[PDB]
Design an enzyme around this catalytic site. Structure first.
Site, PDB file in Angstrom:
ATOM      1  CB  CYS B 105      -1.016  -0.102   1.114  1.00 15.42           C
ATOM      2  SG  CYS B 105      -2.462   0.914   0.784  1.00 15.42           S
ATOM      3  CG  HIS B 125      -3.430   2.923  -2.348  1.00 14.10           C
ATOM      4  ND1 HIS B 125      -3.998   4.049  -2.913  1.00 14.10           N
ATOM      5  CD2 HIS B 125      -4.451   2.097  -2.045  1.00 14.10           C
ATOM      6  CE1 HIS B 125      -5.313   3.933  -2.886  1.00 14.10           C
ATOM      7  NE2 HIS B 125      -5.611   2.768  -2.345  1.00 14.10           N
TER       8      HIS B 125
HETATM    9  C1  LIG Z   1      -3.141   2.004   2.265  1.00 15.20           C
HETATM   10  O1  LIG Z   1      -3.293   1.168   3.355  1.00 15.20           O
HETATM   11  C2  LIG Z   1      -2.218   3.045   2.382  1.00 15.20           C
HETATM   12  O2  LIG Z   1      -1.102   2.903   2.857  1.00 15.20           O
HETATM   13  N1  LIG Z   1      -2.637   4.081   1.644  1.00 15.20           N
HETATM   14  C3  LIG Z   1      -3.938   3.848   1.349  1.00 15.20           C
HETATM   15  C4  LIG Z   1      -4.828   4.660   0.817  1.00 15.20           C
HETATM   16  C5  LIG Z   1      -6.125   4.230   0.678  1.00 15.20           C
HETATM   17  C6  LIG Z   1      -6.517   2.952   1.082  1.00 15.20           C
HETATM   18  F1  LIG Z   1      -7.781   2.625   0.922  1.00 15.20           F
HETATM   19  C7  LIG Z   1      -5.595   2.123   1.683  1.00 15.20           C
HETATM   20  C8  LIG Z   1      -4.326   2.611   1.793  1.00 15.20           C
END
Ligand SMILES: *[C@@]1(=O)C(=O)[N]C2=[C][C]=C(F)[C]=C21
Ligand SMILES: *[C@@]1(=O)C(=O)[N]C2=[C][C]=C(F)[C]=C21
Ligand SMILES: [Cl-]
Ligand SMILES: [Cl-]
Lengths: 187, 187
Positions: B105, B125
């Site tokens: 992510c 992500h």
């Molecule tokens: C994720 O866990 C992160 O590190 N950034 C992000 C943005 C949106 C999401 F839905 C999960 C995550």
């Protein structure tokens, strides 16, 4: 007014089935209470992840009722839920008020133990089917998520996002569930 | 001998991205240490799930090295990982010994912060892409999981099972990963 969810957390709960719905419902703006079956102390989940509940179940019940009561699976978690008189009372009250009840994996076997929602179409983990179907009190489904009225069931860790999003859709509608889903990078 | 995984758990970690890999790796017989960045005390994840780490990172490092070091995402978790000199040391050591590093992510942005694995193909992500790509030190991929040698990255909560199973496959092989996958009821 914001919807409110009660997640009942027992020793031996499947931690993925606990955390995914909590997180996803919070993403949807639902007020979620992670309630410890045994009291206020941290809970050792099935694969040894330790989660600190927001409250004891005893305390959380005083703040009821809730728009959904959520039962995670894990064989041993579900057994603890099935054996609990406090859980029986909560589910009976929820059913009597036409509130949603959501259970995943072995979790739906607690509905059997507490005589909840007989006649409903349900799913479970494949390995929990025979237990759930003892007596033929439900009709069995292989759908990844099954929603029959106010009884919403699902199959396993790998259906937990779908389960959680079905709860969100039931409480907050299709558009909120779609908005919550998009950033998750689901297939 | 059993493989060993270090999962680094910071305030603001995405709890789904933390729990799914821990659980799935334990299912695969991997010895997993959930290590608290800040010390031994419980950790408030991004959506307010509280997880009690197995050990402080300080203590877990003494039991190294590990076959994989795993970095969950969550924006604020990843920032805390990126700012940590202790994390820098662990990742540098891991890279120097040709040990696997796995990040999901926003988690891969800590690899950038600590100058790890430059030149690798990576994913993140979608919202973390521009951060990860600042300087063009990696090549970007939209694959749900990307494994380039000993740098294994993935995109979000909804890719966490795939990420975890890729770790299992890297450490324990294809057949163990398939055996672990089947009971999970993944699509
Ligand atoms: C994720 O866990 C992160 O590190 N950034 C992000 C943005 C949106 C999401 F839905 C999960 C995550
Ligand atoms: C599930 O969480 C449960 O309650 N029963 C079961 C069996 C196997 C599995 F992989 C998950 C679960
Ligand atoms: Cl289990
Ligand atoms: Cl986040």
């Amino acid at each position: 007014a914001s919807k409110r969810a009660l997640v009942i957390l027992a020793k031996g709960a499947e931690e993925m089935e606990t955390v995914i719905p909590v997180d996803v419902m919070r993403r949807a703006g639902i007020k979620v209470t992670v309630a410890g079956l045994a009291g206020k102390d941290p809970v050792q989940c099935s694969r040894d992840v330790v989660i600190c509940p927001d409250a004891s179940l005893e305390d959380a019940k005083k703040e009821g009722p809730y728009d959904v009561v959520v039962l995670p699976g894990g064989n041993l978690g579900a057994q603890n839920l099935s054996e609990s008189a406090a859980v029986k009372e909560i589910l009976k009250e929820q059913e009597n008020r036409k509130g949603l009840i959501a259970a995943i994996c072995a979790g739906p076997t607690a509905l059997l133990a507490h005589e909840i929602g007989f006649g409903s179409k349900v799913t479970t983990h494949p390995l929990a089917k025979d237990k759930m179907m003892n007596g033929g009190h439900y009709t069995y489904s292989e759908n990844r998520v099954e929603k029959d009225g106010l009884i919403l069931t699902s199959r396993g860790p790998g259906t937990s996002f779908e389960f959680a999003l079905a709860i969100v859709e039931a409480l907050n509608g299709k558009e909120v569930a779609a908005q919550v889903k998009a950033p998750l990078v689901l297939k």
